[PDB]
């Protein structure tokens, strides 16, 4: 529910007490609140937030109108957050607490066309005792005369990566408001300089 | 529970009472409990 938008900065090594901690640095920059979705107006409850600034010249006439209505500044990234109704213009301070478990989401790094061995952890085959199918190649796609078809969903080579990925229950190690930073234990999906969506634990333990 | 496909009278205590379209037996002695599924 209570969420924000940021940018993956990098990973570093940090200590808390006597133990080292791998940390992903997120610049969870200030988010203008740009549209309040109400059951009365939209049919569901949500908030449209904004992220990186955009030069006024780069902004088209229709997007200018959408921003001018809320009287903000044009952004570039616009996302909603269901059931989260704050007051003012969204920043991590007081939103997230040091220690709080969070749900980091982004777009995985894309690996293009990837065959069954990498894409699905296949096995491929013998590298030596007679082959033409040396390592990658799937085996049998099916059976015989029976479902003279191949099962829908059959794990096959395709475009791997560049998908939405949510990583549940990540520790909030440190927070540097004003610097608009948030240290998170572990690995968030996507590449550095990528959009990230940090929110309240989907369903906490 | 002794699931016997042929439930018959054993002693004067068993009461044959049907349940959800199946023959079931309720008795005082725990061993006497007979059913069909």
């Amino acid at each position: 529910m209570k969420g924000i938008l940021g940018t993956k900065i990098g990973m570093t090594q940090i200590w808390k007490n006597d133990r080292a901690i791998p940390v992903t640095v997120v610049l969870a920059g200030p988010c203008p609140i740009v549209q309040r979705k109400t059951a009365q107006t939209d049919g569901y409850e949500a908030v449209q937030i904004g992220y990186a600034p955009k030069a006024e010249r780069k902004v088209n006439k229709p997007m200018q109108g959408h921003f001018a209505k809320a009287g903000v500044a044009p952004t570039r990234i616009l996302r909603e957050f269901r059931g989260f109704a704050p007051d003012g213009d969204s920043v991590n301070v007081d939103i997230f607490a040091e220690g709080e478990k969070i749900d980091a989401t982004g777009t995985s790094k894309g690996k293009g066309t990837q065959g069954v061995m990498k894409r699905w952890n296949f096995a491929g085959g013998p590298a030596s005792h007679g082959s033409k199918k040396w390592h990658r190649r799937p085996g049998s796609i099916g059976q015989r005369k029976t479902p003279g078809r191949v099962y829908k969903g059959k794990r096959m080579a395709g475009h791997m990566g560049m998908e939405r990925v949510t990583v549940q229950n990540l520790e909030v190690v440190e927070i540097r408001a004003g610097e608009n930073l948030i240290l998170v234990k572990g690995a968030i999906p996507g590449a550095n300089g990528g959009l990230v969506v940090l929110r309240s634990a989907a369903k906490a333990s | 529970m002794k699931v016997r496909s042929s439930v018959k009278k054993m002693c004067d205590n068993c009461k044959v009472v049907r349940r959800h379209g199946r023959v079931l037996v309720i008795c005082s002695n725990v061993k006497h409990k007979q059913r069909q599924g």
């Binding site: 078809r149 099962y151 829908k152 969903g153 | -």
Partner: protein
């Protein structure tokens, strides 16, 4: 030789589903949708009326709603893509119970498919009055 048609008419009927046995109600709707008493009486096209169903949630079913009435609807390649729901469990979709019983008694071709546009089901009483700016000639079952 035999007489053919026109289309200047598009009769809208307002059947109430309240307490009517499902198939018994269904029959009436499917017949008024195809061409029962039929305007010019022809089958190369749709002469049928635009049935509007109200009180879908209050429809009647005999001995079993809990048991027997099971809507099997098996998804993509059946990799156990076998989905089943009890008729009681259709508290989620009352409108699809009437809908997917009436379509069941309609022709199935190019035209037949065109005919499901005519049926317009709603679970309410006063709230269905959405598609109720054209005609509202109420016809009872039996």
């Amino acid at each position: 030789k035999t007489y053919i048609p026109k289309n200047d008419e598009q009769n809208w009927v307002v059947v109430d589903a309240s307490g009517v046995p499902l198939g018994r109600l269904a029959t009436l709707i499917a017949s008024r949708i195809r061409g029962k008493h039929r305007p010019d009486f022809t089958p190369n096209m749709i002469q049928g009326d635009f049935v509007v169903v109200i009180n879908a949630a209050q429809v009647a079913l005999t001995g079993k709603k809990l048991d027997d009435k099971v809507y099997t609807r098996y998804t993509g390649y059946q990799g156990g893509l076998k989905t089943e729901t009890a008729r009681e469990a259709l508290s989620k979709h009352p409108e699809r119970v009437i809908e997917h019983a009436v379509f069941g008694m309609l022709p199935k071709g190019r035209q037949g498919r065109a005919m499901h546009t005519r049926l317009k089901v709603y679970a309410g009483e006063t709230h269905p009055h959405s598609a109720q700016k054209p005609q509202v000639l109420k016809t009872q079952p039996l």
